[PDB]
Design a protein around this ligand. Structure first.
Ligand code: SF4
Ligand code: SF4
Ligand code: FES
Ligand code: FES
Lengths: 692, 213
């Protein structure tokens, strides 16, 4: 079923029917290109992958020539070496003289490409000159100078097929061809900024990071995205103090070399509103103070209030470290109170399902299994919003194979074709027994997918009890080699927190605390906090969580520390620190160590490796990094998820409203960054953001 | 090759179909398979150019709503073609050829006679909304070499002295030619007269058979 051929003497075998350029990549003979891409449709617009083929009258493009057996591929024919210089020279007679103002200085693929294979001179010295192109306003996210564009089609095929915003397009013939809406209307898909990593010239580039640095100055650091349930494998570009930008480093499973929009532009809030020193409340006024004085005030007011048990509330947030929450849980339960609750509304109890049986809070199919998916249904979520990388996988599957999606709850605009069913758990229960009890029994590799917003609803448990019956009832959705129950989170950390055992007891859910511990956790209200409560915030920037506080503690953000994160898939991933904590911020668990020391609590560690062993004690799957194991406990896990909230939850007719208010305003950084404020204003039902 | 959102060209200015035009469009869509119901995007916009005198932006939005399409595909297809004219023009669209077979028989003096009888540039239109010049390439009527095109009727074999007649003729309102040239030759005939095919009757293939049928 495979084909062996010869590229430059190198024999190489590749699967039949594939493209020749992948065979050149497999053989190790580097062939330059401009408009081939792996994850995209193939168009031969670039003319760069010209290559000599025995039994061919003319040299042909290697991107779209299909693999045939008995093939002799030559790349160094003098005709081909002529041809590459030719095509480069043809490309470089309307591209404008913008190399010192173009953003991709060292990263111009065209440019490095034109050093190997370019001509010495360029005989453009015509009088009346090149063409020139309109400014083409698009949005506040994507800087646009269409003069530098070469119509390499790589933007528009992506936003067409995978991003699913078909507003981009090619309009006009010859040099009157342009790219984009000639309405001059606003583009938005929920992964909008992914085109500026994709246009190989600086036609489309980064608007907030417009000219601030330049890719030879940069220090690069491979790390993990947060404020996203997938925890995409990213790269931090940093000058050394600030954080310049983020670019998705390639990874096969988790992101297929794509990244969320909010994940992209989040570096603005990472440098503008940060906590740089500890501030103690005077009474309607904070003053900054000695780093001893803050923690000594913590110990002093602990001796004043004395929470002896079930009065030390400890709440963590959305982008918080697993390694920090270990220190948190250790401190609280050596303190003698498991008032250990999430930030979410209806987080003050257990989240209506098992903290046991990791399957209860994880994504049990593979994300790679979504290529093999058949017919699924969302409940109570917008997966276009929550984990837009997942939506990219959904649309790629739906275009590739033949699928069926249902959507129960909020009416969303997908890129793909949804099928709505209702806005009631009774409408849901009607739909399960209506027609898809037959379909999901029929389907080979389906799944069923649940957003985390239903955890907000107090009627979650019966909301589980229906669906927990159905997985139990249908053996097709619950077989050995995968499990159809699949849940997501809004964070990169509440999955890791549910690995920690970050849940209050039924007893701990009752008492109003006296000493509230904020660790991130922006979305608390004045209702969630007691009146006289000791409310020491530990975070990185200034949000609502820092506004209620008594003492704030500058902790490092996700960039500055050696983080450890768990996605909804369950991948334990290292976040390599790109820079040091700025000002007077420190790392979080190191702060909790000293906070223990000014109490009677003795944490048994002082290093990072001893934390790694303590973390191995909580779960050894979190020191064994980034390797996804399945669960051998499917049926017992679903049954134990059924038995707990069985019956006692009485589901009301509350409509399944939207989980989040806006996408680009959450998680204390989209509110910190001014670029997401101006992103938020431009993105609701505007005449440039409307369709018709 | 782009759009300005100033006046008379808005997504908000309304457009509908005449019911005869509506029924004609419903006739056209049934000619194609329903899987490719969007494949009729070419002549349907033609109907728009029949109803409204130019291709507006509103007609394109209305067709994209009609065919269940994203609007950018309509935007592409009507941009990619020449004839879907996106600016309001006059009543009479001048399509004067410039290509070398028209040129070698003197299409230069034709165009110069036109734009000296008028005063406008070949992209410019007449301020009375009567005549809208457009140079154009070889319209397929290359043998009758000095030619032009009123909206559908090609006018052929033109002398520039006789051409400005036709120009002020259409300017008077109710005077075009019948559609052909200035009553010389025919269309395929030589300039002198019909040399070959001077037979009054069609000779039949009924005897002219293969003999093996
Ligand atoms: S893309 Fe920009 S930097 Fe690269 S060669 Fe072109 S003008 Fe120069
Ligand atoms: S918009 Fe950019 S990526 Fe797309 S074809 Fe033009 S230059 Fe290439
Ligand atoms: S990618 Fe091979 S020719 Fe454009
Ligand atoms: S040659 Fe100009 S129209 Fe035929």
């Amino acid at each position: 079923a495979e084909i062996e051929l010869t590229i430059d003497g190198h024999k190489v075998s590749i699967e039949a029917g594939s493209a020749l350029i992948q065979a050149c990549e497999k053989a190790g003979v580097t062939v330059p290109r401009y408009c081939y891409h792996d994850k995209l449709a193939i168009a031969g617009n670039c003319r760069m992958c010209l290559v000599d083929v025995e039994r061919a009258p003319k040299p042909v493009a290697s991107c779209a020539y299909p693999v045939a057996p008995g093939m002799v591929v030559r790349t160094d024919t003098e005709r081909v070496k002529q041809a590459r210089e030719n095509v480069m020279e043809m490309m470089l007679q309307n591209h404008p003289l913008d190399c010192p103002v173009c953003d991709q200085g060292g990263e111009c693929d065209l440019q490095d490409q034109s050093m190997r294979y370019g001509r010495d001179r360029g005989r453009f010295t015509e009088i009346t000159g090149k063409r020139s192109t309109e400014d083409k306003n698009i949005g506040p996210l994507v800087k646009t100078s269409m003069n530098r564009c070469i119509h390499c089609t790589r933007c528009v095929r992506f936003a067409n097929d995978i991003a699913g915003a078909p507003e981009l397009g090619s309009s006009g013939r010859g040099n009157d061809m342009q790219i984009g809406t000639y309405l001059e209307k606003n583009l938005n898909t929920e992964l909008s900024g992914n085109v500026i990593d994709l246009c190989p010239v600086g036609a489309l580039t980064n608007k907030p990071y417009a000219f601030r640095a330049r890719p030879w100055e940069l220090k690069k650091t491979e790390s993990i995205d947060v404020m996203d349930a997938v925890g995409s494998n990213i790269r931090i570009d940093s000058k050394g103090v600030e954080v310049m930008r983020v670019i998705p480093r390639v990874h096969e499973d988790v992101n297929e070399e794509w990244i969320n929009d909010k994940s992209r532009f989040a570096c603005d809030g990472l440098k503008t509103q940060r906590l740089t020193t500890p501030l103690i409340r005077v009474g309607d006024k904070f003053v900054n103070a000695t780093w001893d004085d803050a923690l000594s005030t913590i110990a002093k007011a602990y001796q004043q209030k004395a929470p002896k048990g079930d009065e030390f509330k400890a709440v963590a947030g959305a982008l918080v470290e697993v390694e920090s929450m270990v220190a948190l849980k250790d401190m609280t339960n050596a303190l003698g109170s498991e008032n250990t609750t999430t930030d979410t509304p209806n987080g003050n109890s257990a989240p209506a399902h098992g903290i046991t049986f990791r399957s209860n809070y994880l994504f049990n199919s593979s994300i790679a299994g979504i290529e093999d998916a058949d017919a699924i249904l969302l409940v109570g979520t917008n997966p276009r919003r929550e984990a837009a990388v997942m939506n990219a996988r959904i649309r790629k599957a739906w275009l590739r194979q033949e699928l069926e999606i249902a959507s129960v709850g909020p009416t969303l605009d997908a890129t793909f074709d949804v099928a709505e069913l209702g806005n009631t758990h009774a409408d849901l229960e009607k739909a399960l027994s209506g027609e898809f009890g037959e379909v999901l029994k029929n389907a080979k590799n389906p799944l069923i997918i649940v957003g985390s917003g239903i955890t907000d609803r107090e009627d979650a448990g019966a909301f589980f009890n229906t669906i927990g019956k159905f997985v139990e009832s249908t053996p097709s959705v619950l077989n050995e080699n995968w499990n159809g129950y699949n849940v997501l989170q809004r964070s990169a950390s509440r999955a890791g927190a549910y690995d920690i055992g970050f849940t209050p007891s039924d007893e701990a859910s009752k008492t109003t605390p006296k000493m509230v511990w904020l660790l991130g956790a922006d979305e608390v209200a004045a209702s969630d906090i007691p009146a006289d409560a000791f409310v020491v915030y530990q975070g990185h920037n200034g949000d609502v969580g820092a506004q209620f506080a008594d003492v704030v503690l500058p902790g490092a953000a996700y960039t500055e520390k050696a983080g450890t994160y768990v996605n909804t898939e369950g991948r334990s991933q290292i976040s390599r620190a790109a820079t040091g904590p700025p000002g007077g911020a420190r790392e979080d668990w190191k702060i909790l160590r000293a906070v223990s020391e000014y109490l009677g609590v003795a944490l048994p560690y002082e290093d990072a490796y001893e934390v790694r062993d303590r973390l191995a004690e909580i779960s050894p799957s979190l020191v064994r990094y980034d390797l996804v194991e399945p669960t051998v406990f499917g049926d017992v896990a679903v049954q134990h998820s059924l038995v707990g909230p069985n019956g006692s939850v009485t589901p009301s007719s509350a409509p399944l409203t939207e989980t989040i208010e806006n996408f680009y305003m959450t998680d204390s950084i989209s509110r910190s960054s001014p670029t997401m404020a101006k992103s938020s204003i431009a993105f609701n039902k505007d005449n440039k953001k409307n369709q018709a | 090759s782009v759009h300005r959102n100033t006046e008379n060209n808005n997504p908000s200015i309304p457009f509908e179909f005449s019911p005869e035009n509506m029924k004609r469009a419903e006739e056209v869509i049934a000619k194609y398979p329903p899987q490719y119901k969007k494949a009729a995007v070419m002549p349907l916009l033609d109907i728009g150019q029949r109803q409204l005198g130019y291709t507006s932006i509103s007609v394109m939005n209305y067709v994209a709503k009609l065919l269940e399409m994203p609007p950018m595909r309509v935007y592409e297809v009507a941009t990619f073609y020449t004839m879907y004219n996106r600016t309001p023009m006059g009543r009479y669209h001048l399509q004067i050829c410039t290509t070398t077979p028209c040129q070698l028989c003197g299409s230069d003096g034709i165009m110069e006679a036109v734009q000296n009888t008028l005063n406008i540039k070949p992209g410019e239109t007449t301020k009375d909304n009567l005549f809208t010049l457009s140079e154009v390439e070889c319209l397929g009527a290359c043998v009758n070499a000095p030619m032009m095109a009123i909206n559908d009727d090609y006018y052929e074999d033109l002398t520039p002295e006789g051409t400005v007649k036709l120009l002020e003729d259409c300017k008077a309102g109710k005077m075009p030619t019948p559609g052909p040239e200035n009553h010389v030759r025919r269309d395929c005939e030589p300039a002198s007269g019909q040399k070959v095919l001077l037979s009054k009757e069609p000779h039949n293939v009924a005897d002219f058979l293969q003999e093996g049928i």
